[PDB]
Design a protein around this ligand. Structure first.
Ligand SMILES: CCOc1c(C)cc(C)cc1CNc1nnn[nH]1
Ligand code: NA
Ligand code: NA
Length: 298
């Protein structure tokens, strides 16, 4: 299933920390020290590590900022329920703590829900959005791909799901490498495993799949996601959408629809890809973001 043949495994970024709502959040901060930054938002079950091979394409021209979401990566681990709303609160405060004004967003998965939700609420501060495998409402399980349907239905329970994700670390050991076409190496996996070595620290990994808007639940997330999707369809903000085949959250047919239904939207085919497109073709993702940036300002 996993086909293979140079994707870098190192993380050559100095750590930065900022105090946000009584907690330390870790972030990458490279490139120019001022000017419009490009803000990279990872989703589940990743961290700023997800962007390690994309950032170097952008850092020559723009400040690059990539936070680790609260409870993830190298950020602190407060005793939260880690609902989407918790991530909204911490990211909002992170952005303000850095004094960011106008930004360009580069977003994925739950980072895309964060990014789109933030953009909706702050539309005057978003110069452009690059996105890939983003969250939109999923009307029924019929539309969720069969290869991962029984798995994600099991994840979305309080007994079986917590046993799988918290006790057996199945989201890291199972779902993560399943979301990449090529085989992730032990080194890359160990980077991803690092924040979750202890079962008690896996709460964020269980709550996030339980927050996905599937079959109308949870209703608050469904409504929130519908709201930012409605915003996106009427917004003239420049959009760059990366998609793979067969993809997972954004299949080729959905990408094609969005190419027409989203204003000012350019799409890029990265080739083979499932969920973590950044791990299959970071070169093209990085280079195309870089090609797109000059057209946004100046
Ligand atoms: C087929 C399922 O797609 C996924 C796959 C194949 C792998 C992963 C790591 C994640 C997802 C889904 N994204 C996600 N789950 N909970 N929060 N965000
Ligand atoms: Na998760
Ligand atoms: Na690259």
């Amino acid at each position: 299933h996993h086909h293979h043949h140079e994707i870098g495994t190192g993380f050559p970024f100095d750590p930065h920390y900022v105090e946000v709502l009584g907690e330390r959040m870790h972030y990458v901060d490279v490139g120019p020290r001022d000017g419009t930054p490009v803000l990279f938002l990872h989703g589940n079950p990743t961290s700023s590590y997800l962007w390690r091979n994309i950032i170097p394409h952008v850092a020559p021209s723009h400040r690059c900022i990539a936070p680790d979401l609260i409870g993830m990566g190298k950020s602190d681990k407060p005793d939260l329920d880690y609902f989407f709303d918790d991530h909204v609160r911490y990211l909002d405060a992170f952005i303000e703590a850095l004094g960011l004004e106008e930004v360009v967003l580069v977003i994925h998965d739950w980072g895309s829900a964060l990014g789109f939700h933030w953009a909706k609420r702050n539309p005057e501060r978003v110069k452009g959005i690059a996105c890939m495998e983003f969250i939109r409402p999923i009307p029924t399980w019929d539309e969720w791909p069969e290869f991962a349907r029984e798995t994600f239905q099991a994840f979305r329970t309080a007994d079986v799901g917590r046993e799988l994700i918290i006790d057996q670390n199945a989201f890291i050991e199972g779902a993560l490498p399943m979301g990449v076409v090529r085989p992730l190496t032990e080194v890359e996996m160990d980077h991803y495993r690092e924040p979750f070595l202890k079962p008690v620290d896996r709460e964020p990994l269980w709550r996030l799949p339980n927050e996905l808007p599937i079959a109308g639940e949870p209703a608050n997330i469904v409504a929130l996601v519908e709201a930012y999707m409605n915003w996106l369809h009427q917004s003239p903000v420049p959009k760059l959408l990366f998609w793979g085949t067969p993809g997972v959250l954004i299949p080729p047919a959905e990408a094609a629809r969005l190419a027409e239904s989203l204003p000012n939207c350019k799409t890029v085919d990265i080739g083979p890809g499932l969920f973590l497109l950044q791990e299959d073709n970071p070169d093209l993702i990085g280079s195309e973001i870089a090609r797109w940036l000059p057209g946004l300002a100046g």
